[PDB]
Structure 1
Amino acid sequence: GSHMMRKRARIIYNPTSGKEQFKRELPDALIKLEKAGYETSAYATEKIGDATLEAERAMHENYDVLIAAGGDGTLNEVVNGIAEKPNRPKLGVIPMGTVNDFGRALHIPNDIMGALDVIIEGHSTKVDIGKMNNRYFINLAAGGQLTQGPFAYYIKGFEMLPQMKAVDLRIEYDGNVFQGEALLFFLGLTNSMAGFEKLVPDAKLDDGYFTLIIVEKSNLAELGHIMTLASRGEHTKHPKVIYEKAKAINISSFTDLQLNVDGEYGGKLPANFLNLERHIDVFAPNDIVNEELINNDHVDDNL
C-alpha cells in the first residue's frame, strides 16, 4: 500500500505541444503520480524559453523528478536548465510533441499513462547530452550554407543536401582535423529522425561520443549516389560521407554558416562542442533491451 517515502515531482508542460491533449489529462496524471507517492505540482509554459526558466527555478526547490511533457523542444529546454548542475533531478518524459525523437530513442511509450507507468516503475538510464558553446542539446546539431532557411526548422536526414552550397570548413575533433569544403556536418547524439531510421549503423546514446558526419563537396553524380545510398541507410559507405565518433569537436570557418540545434536555429559559428557522457538520468522502460545503449542495467532480465 505504501512502499516508499514521499517524493517530490514537478511537471513542466507545454499546453500547445503536439495534439495539445496533455492539459486536460493533467488532473488524472496528478492522481496517478500521487497514488505512487509523488507530491506533484505543475507548470505551464507560455512561450519559448519558459521551460528552461522553470527548470532553473526547480533546481533550488529539491525535486526528485522533473517530468517534461511536450516535444523535443520542451525536453531540450528542460535539459538546458538543469545541465551541469549538482543534484539534478531525474528526468521523466511524456512525449506530447509532434515529433518525439528523444522519446523514440529511449522507447518511451507514446501514450500519457504508459509514459507515467515508466516513470513510476522508476528504472532509469544515463544519456549523453551535447554542450555547444554555452548551450545544450539532446538530439542533433547540424550546419551548412544554402546555395545563392531550413536551418530554422526540423532537420529531416539528408533531404536538404541538394540545397547545400560547398563551404570551406575547419572541424577539429579529438585532435584530428578536417579542413576542406563540405556541404553539411551533423553532430548526432540520438540516431533516428524523419529521413533516417538510423543516421549511423552503430550509434550509442551513452558512449560519450557524438556521431560526427561530414558530407564533403560532391559533384552531381556523387550527390545522386549519396541520396540513393541514404534512402536505404548505406550513406556512410560513400567516400564523401565522413563518419567519426568524437567527444570534443571545434568548428570554424572564415565564411558564414547557419546552425540548427535540436530542430531550431542555433545561431552562428564558431562553435565548440563537448559530449557530456551519461550526463542525464532519465526514466526508461525496464522491459526493452535498448540496442543504442551500452549500459542496460535498468532492464530487468526476467522481463
Structure 2
Amino acid sequence: SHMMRKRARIIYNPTSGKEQFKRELPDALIKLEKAGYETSAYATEKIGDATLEAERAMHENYDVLIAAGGDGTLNEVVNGIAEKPNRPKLGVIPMGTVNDFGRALHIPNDIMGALDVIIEGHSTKVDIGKMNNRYFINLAAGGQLTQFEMLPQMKAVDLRIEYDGNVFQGEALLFFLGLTNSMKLVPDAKLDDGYFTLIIVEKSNLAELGHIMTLASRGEHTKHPKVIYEKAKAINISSFTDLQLNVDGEYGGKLPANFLNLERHIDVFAPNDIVNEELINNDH
C-alpha cells in the first residue's frame, strides 16, 4: 500500500471500435481498485454524453478521468474539463477504430497495457486548441468542395488568415491547423510547444496539383512554394464565401473561426518506458 486512496471515473463508449471494453470493465475496475483508485464508470449513449459527464465530474473531486473510446470520446471529455480549475489527470484507453491522439502519445492499444500506463502515474502536458468557444486535440481543416487526398476536390476560395502578427490574404484550396500529426507530417512538429502547425495550400493549376500530390506521397509537400508552413499560437480565419470546417475528424461548423493554442494545457498519463520525438519535455 504505497499511496493514499484516490478517486477515478471511467467515461466509456460501449459501442466503440471492437466494443470489447464493456466486457472487460469488471477486470479494469479490479485492477484500478488494487492500485488504490475508488473507481466508478459512466456509459455514454449519444454524442455529447461524454462532455456532459465530464462537466458533472468536475464537481466531484476525481484524481483521474479515464476516457475509453475513440478520438471523439476523448475530444468530448477534454471539452468538458478544458479551462476549468482543478482538472483531473486524463487517462486514455484507445477503444476506437482509429486513435490518433493515443498513437501520438504511444498509448498501448491493449486495455491492460493502457491501464498499466495510468496506474504507473507518469504524465505529460499537451497543448490543446480552442476554436471559438469549443476545444480540439488533433486537427482542424477547412475548404470548399467543388460545385491531402481530398485536395483535387477543393475549389479555390478567397480567405484571410491572421496568424499571430502576420496576414495571409488570397485564394486557397485548404488550410490545416494541426496539434498532433499522426492521423502524415510536418518534419519538426511538437505536441509541447504551444504552436499549431499551420498549413495553407494556395490556389494552384493542374500541374502544381500533380506536383504537390507527388511530393505529398513521400513526405515532401512542405517543399512546394504553394504550400505554406508556419507555426502560430493565435490564428483567426474569415472569408466572404462559406467554408466547411472539420474538427478532430468530424464536421465542426463553419467560419469565421478564432483559434488559440492552449500551451501544455492537459495532463495525460503517458509511458515512462518510451521516448516521444514530438515532445520538448520528457521529464516523465
TM-score range, shorter chain: over 0.9
SS of match in other structure, 2:229: strand
SS at match of 2:78: helix
> SS at 1:128's partner residue?
strand
Q: SS state of the match for residue 201, structure 2? A: strand
1:30-51 CA distance string (max 9 Å, x none) = 0000000000000000000000
2:248 maps to which residue? 262
- Aligned pairs, number: 284
User: After superposition, what is the alpha-carbon deviation per residue over 1:21-79, rounded to whole angstroms, capped at 9, x for unaligned?
Assistant: 10000000000000000000000000000000000000000000000000000000000
Alignment partners' CA distance in 1, 2:182 and 2:211: 21
Q: Equivalents in 2 of 1:192, 1:165: separation in Å?
A: 26
The alignment status of 1:233 with 2:219, answered yes or no, reads yes
Q: Among residues 166, 178, 195, which one is paired with 1:176 in the alignment?
A: 166
Partner of 2:139: 140
- Per-residue Cα deviation, 1:80-137 (whole angstroms, up to 9, x for no partner): 0000000000000000001000000000000000000000000000000000000000
CA offsets per residue over residues 156-198 of structure 1, 9 Å max, x none?
xx001000000000000001000000000000000111xxxx3
Task: Supply the distance in 2 between the matched residues of 1:247 and 1:276 (Cα, whole angstroms).
Answer: 8
Q: Give per-residue Cα distances to partners, 1:194-222, cap 9 Å, x unaligned.
A: xxxx3200000010000000000010001
* Residues in 2 aligned to 1:270 and 1:38: alpha-carbon distance in whole angstroms: 44
Q: Distance in 1 between matches of 2:98 and 2:118?
A: 20
Q: How far apart, CA to CA, are the structure 2 residues paired with 1:216 and 1:39?
A: 53
Q: In structure 2, how many angstroms separate the alpha carbons of the residues matched to 1:18 and 1:230?
A: 29
Rounded to whole Å, the distance in 1 between the matches of 2:282 and 2:25 is: 31
| Deviation sequence 1:206-244 (CA, Å, 0-9, x none) | 100000000000100011111101111000000000000
RMSD: 0.4
Q: Show structure 1 runs of 5+ residues with no match.
A: 149-157, 299-303
Counterparts of 2:221 and 2:246 in 1: how far apart (Å)?
21
Give secondary structure in 2 for the equivalent of 1:177.
strand
Q: Which secondary structure state, in structure 1, belongs to the residue aligned with residue 225 of structure 2?
A: coil
How many angstroms does 1:265 deviate by? 0.5
1:18 partner SS: coil
SS in 1 for 2:33: helix
Q: Secondary structure at the match of 1:186?
A: strand
SS in 1 for 2:86: coil
Identical columns (%): 100
Match of 1:59? 58
* Separation in structure 1 between the aligned mates of residue 134 and residue 185 of structure 2, nearest angstrom: 23
What SS is found at the alignment partner of 2:113?
A: helix
Q: 2 CA distance for matches of 1:126 and 1:251?
A: 27
Superposed counterparts of 1:21-36, under 5 Å = 21-36=20-35
| In structure 1, C-alpha distance between the alignment counterparts of 2:237 and 2:197, rounded to whole Å | 15
CA distance in 2 between partners of 1:243 and 1:104 (Å): 23
Q: What runs of 5+ residues in structure 2 fail to find an aligned partner?
A: none
In 2: Cα distance, 1:182 partner to 1:104 partner = 30
